[PDB]
Every structure is written in C-alpha cells, then in structure tokens.
Structure 1
Amino acid sequence: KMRDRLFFLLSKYGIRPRDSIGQHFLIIEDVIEKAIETANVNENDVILEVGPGLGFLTDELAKRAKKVYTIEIDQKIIEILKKEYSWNNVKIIQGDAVRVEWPKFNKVVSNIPYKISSPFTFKLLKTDFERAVVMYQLEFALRMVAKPGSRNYSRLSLMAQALGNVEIVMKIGKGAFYPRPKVDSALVLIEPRKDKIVLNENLVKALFQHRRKTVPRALKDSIHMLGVSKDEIRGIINNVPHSNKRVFQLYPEEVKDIEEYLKKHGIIS
C-alpha cells in the first residue's frame, strides 16, 4: 500500500534502492505513526530527521511539527523530495549526517541508515535534546541497553547509560521495509539522563579498545600506543580504582573514578 507508493516513485524517477549509503525504506504506515506518537510530536517541536528517503516519515513529521530539518546525503533523493512534496516547514540539508553541522532541535525522529547507527548515536548523546525516537537493527538496539558485565556491553552501551535513558519500545519485523533486511529492527526511545556522567572520550576509547582486558592492562596498552613511555605510567596506572574489573564490567560511575584519578595523576590533562 505504502509499498506500492514506493514502487511507483522508484520507477517514476528510475532509481533503485542503493544499499551503498543505506536504503531499506520504511513502508508500514503504522510503524511511522507509532514512532511519531512515541516522540509526542506537536506544533511546538523542532524535529531532526536523518535520511528522509522518499519522505514518508518526513511527511507525517511536517504535518505535526513547527519545523523539520532533514539531512539527506543523496542529491537525487533531495531533488525528488522537492518535486514530490510541498511542505512549508521542512528544511532539507544536503550531506552526510555524521559530518555536517546539526541545526538546533528538541526532538529526533528517524529511520537511521544502519551503517551510521554507531557514530550517529554518539553524536546524538552529546546533544541537548528532549527526546529521540530512532529505528535501529535489533542487535544494535540490544547493545545500547546492555548491562555492565554482559557479553555485549561495549563503549556504546556505556555512553548510552552514562548520558541517556534508553528503552526498546518495540521490535520491528523485516517485512516493514523495502528492500527487506534479514534481521528484525527495533524502535528505540532515548532521553537525556537528568544526572549525566560526562566521561573522557579518549579514556573510554582506550579502555574499550579491548574491553575483555582488566582495567590496568587496558590503560597501559592504550596510552603507550599514543606514543608515551610505559616506564612513565606503570606505577600510577597500577593504583587505578576498580582495578580488579574487566573493562566490560565497568559502570559509568566507575569509569568516572578512573578518569578523576588519571586527571589527579597528570595522565589526562
């Protein structure tokens, strides 16, 4: 039905879904409505969307929001959106959403290109926004909610828990997109944590390079590779708090204790 509208638009502009940048388009109308009501889009909201595709999500956002900014990398899609729709309140921004400057907004509603799930999320969590409702692959959504000390707890999980309140609203079947992905997706709600734990990105990267390591092994490994000498940092690193944990068992609070200790001992400035 919406699938049919898609097939019509695809053949009309003689374009086929290029899995290059990411082009599994959402074609179930009620998934769109559910995303939008979950974000509570109203006449006061300024929305950011990444990857409008053929504008099915965009069109519904435009009806309810004060203003939509939508970042699209593909100039052909942009031309088609402009020809196909008449919105008063949508600003299309050409570029890679990972690279371009984001406008100010209070909400995000997006079917994210799954290839930028990871950088997109880290950028978002660094933003001031009230609420984000975003579609991801299910495994990635589950990684975002992973608990310290689970197998799939990673840098993403830590930063999500440090900076956000994250919730899987529902799973979404393969059948909801064209073309079909071979894994279920998930609709995810993110709000800023009221009591954010701001962590040093270099530290986390260093620690989570190899998240299976004990925290001492990890720390010495990562700062020696920067170009430092390890004779220089052995002792200090050795007294590091939470030293009998592996990196994948660390809570944000515990990373923060490591941070402050490293700052106190000169390691991070």
Structure 2
Amino acid sequence: MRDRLFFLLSKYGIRPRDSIGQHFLIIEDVIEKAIETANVNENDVILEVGPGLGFLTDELAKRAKKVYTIEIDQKIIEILKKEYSWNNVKIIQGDAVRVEWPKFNKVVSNIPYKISSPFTFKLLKTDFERAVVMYQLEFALRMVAKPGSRNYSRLSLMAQALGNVEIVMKIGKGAFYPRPKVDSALVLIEPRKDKIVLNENLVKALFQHRRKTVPRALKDSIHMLGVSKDEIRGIINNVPHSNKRVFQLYPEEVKDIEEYLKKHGIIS
C-alpha cells in the first residue's frame, strides 16, 4: 500500500507534498479501523477532506450511501477521476476551510495537519452525528484538555462546549508517507446533546491571552474595539467568575460572562 502510493506518484510524475503538514495514511488496518469506529453503513452520507490518492475514499465509497470529498489540488482530482470508478462519490475542489460544506451525517477523514484547528472549529458548528478524524497526537491531546490544564485553549473549550471527544487510539508515525516527526491520533467526536453555544467574539477575546484573569482580559479586548476604559471598568469589575484566569473556565462559566455582558449592553 506504500508500494501502491509510490506507483501512483511515479505514474503521474508528482511529488508527495506541496506543503509541510501533509502525510498520506498507508496502513489498510488504520483505514478499516477509522471506518469501523465511525459505523459506516449503506445509509450514511460521509464528508472526507484531503482524499489524497483515494485510499480512505475508496473504502468509504464501498460502504456509504454517498461520499463528498473536498480536495484543494486540481492535479489530485484529475488522478482520482482516472484511477477510480465510483458511482457514489462527489469530489469538491476547494480549501475545505473556505468552501460550503455539503449536508452529511458523518465525517471519516485524515485531516491535513495545517488545517487541524480551522477544520475542527468549523465541524463543531455543524449538524453531524459522528466524526472520526486523524490529527497529530499533540493536537488531539489539546482537544481533550480539561479546564485549568496547561494546554487548555480556545480549541479545548469549544470541543467540550459543543462535542464529546475521545481519542480512540494513538497512530504510529510508521503509518504515513512521508513519516511524520510525531504520532497521530484517531479521534471520535459526537455533538453534545446539551450544547453550550458561546459567542465566538467573546471566546476569541478571552483566549487571545488565556493567561490573564477574566477582568484583565475583558478590559483589554473591549478597549481594543474602540471603547473608553472608564466606560467599561465598573460593569467588568462585577463580571462572574472574576477570580479565574481565562484558561480555567468551563464552557458554563463563559456562558454566564456572555449573559452578563449581553444584559449590560456590551455584546448584542
């Protein structure tokens, strides 16, 4: 399967990456394991991103009703059309972060690592049942980080606010060409049944400097928006969870800051 990649790459005379965050999955058992973890059946409509040379895509097309696969490289698409004969796959040309997504109930995909963050935020705001995606292990660990831990960040918060996230297994670096410098991780995401929907400008504001207390953080980001300090100082000194640093906040605690600011005219 590494061999099949080498033969496809030479056949079309193409180099195995345009960019730095890109690694082809080349173990059949990790593919079949992503698919079994996702429970892909003949009724499911799947989104995939960065199909590469169609290894995962081919397996998804045997099992699902319909697959949409988003690919940025027009040269890769010409190869997927020549190399495969799928009735039920729709290749979409574009940056997966920018293009409109189709309706899908599931995602099964090895994410190019350069887009791990924007893809994840975009997905969490989507109506899906289940997603099984490959990331770097550090990024996956960031996604399951708990409030108050050192790697807890905007990503962690939103993942916990909107999803249930488990790392299914470590994936060895041996399993990609070219070999990454670190291991990847098979990650399951389901939407929370009881989502905590937070204002994105607020969260962005707060975690611009997640090391600050929540009063410092709110005062700085709202001054930056053009508002007098004196106009803001009182309202923000009565903000809930003021004894916390931003990186210690549960989604539930952000929600109360939001409703407090909403009530006091700041966010609208």
Per the shorter chain, which TM-score range?
A: over 0.9
Asked if 2 retains the 8 angstrom alpha-carbon contact of 1:148 and 1:250, the reply is yes
Which whole-Å deviations, capped at 9, do the CAs of 1:132-165 have from their partners, x for residues lacking one?
A: 0000000000000000000000000000000000
SS of the counterpart of 2:193? Answer: coil
- Contact 2:22 2:114 (8 Å CA) reproduced: no
Please state how far the C-alpha of 1:23 moved relative to its aligned partner: 3.0
Aligned-partner Cα distance in 2 for 1:4–1:19:
20
Alignment partners' CA distance in 1, 2:179 and 2:15: 14
Distance in 2, Cα, partners of 1:203 & 1:157: 15
Alignment of 1:98-109 (within 5 A): 98-109=97-108
Deviation at 1:64, TM superposition (A): 0.2
Change (3 A) 1:21 1:107: farther
The equivalent of 1:16 in structure 2 is: 15
SS in 2 for 1:213: coil
Q: Provide, for residues 6-34 of structure 1, a one-character-per-residue CA deviation record: whole Å limited to 9, x for no partner.
A: 00000000001125174310000000000
1:158 is aligned to: 157
Equivalenced residue count is: 268
Cα distance in 2 for partners of 1:81, 1:229 equals 56
- What is the match of residue 187 of structure 2? 188
SS in 2 for 1:147: coil
Instruction: Write the distance in 2 (CA, Å) between the matches of 1:66 and 1:260.
Output: 42
User: Is the 1:164–1:191 contact (alpha carbons within 8 Å) kept by the matching residues of 2?
Assistant: yes
Deviations 1:219-261 (A, max 9, x none): 0011111122211111001100000000000000000000000
Distance in 2 (CA, whole Å) between partners of 1:96 and 1:244 is 41
| Structure 2: runs of 5+ lacking an equivalent | none
The change in CA–CA distance for 1:106 and 1:100 in structure 2 (over 3 A counts) is same
Q: Does structure 2 retain, via aligned residues, the 8 Å contact 1:111–1:134?
A: yes
Deviations 1:147-191 (A, max 9, x none): 000000000000000000000000001100000110010000000
Identical amino acids, percent of aligned pairs? 100
Partner Cα distance (2:229, 2:130) in 1 = 43
Native 8 Å contact 1:69 1:103 kept in 2: yes
- Note the alpha carbon deviations across 1:50-84, whole angstroms, 9 max, x for none: 00000000000000000000000000000000000
> Alignment partner of 1:141: what SS?
helix
Is the CA contact (8 Å cut-off) linking 1:73 and 1:94 kept in structure 2? yes
> Which SS does the other structure have where 1:20 is aligned?
coil
Question: RMSD of the alignment, in Å?
Answer: 0.7
TM-score normalized by the length of structure 2: 0.99
192-201 or 222-231, which deviates more: 222-231
* Deviation per residue, 1:187-229 (Å, 9 max, x gap): 0000000000000000000000000000000000111111222
Work out the CA distance in 2 between the residues paired with 1:22 and 1:63. 28
| Structure 1 segments unaligned to the other structure (5+ residues) | none
2:37 is the alignment partner of 1:48: no
Point out 4+ residue stretches in structure 1 off by more than 6 angstroms. Answer: none
Rounded to whole Å, the distance in 1 between the matches of 2:14 and 2:86 is: 23
In the superposition, relative to structure 1, how do residues 75 and 21 fare at CA in structure 2: closer, same or farther (>3 Å)? farther
8 Å CA contact 1:23–1:53 kept in 2: the answer is no
User: Residue 34 of structure 2: SS of its match in structure 1?
Assistant: helix
Indicate conservation of the 8 Å contact 1:21/1:113, yes or no. no
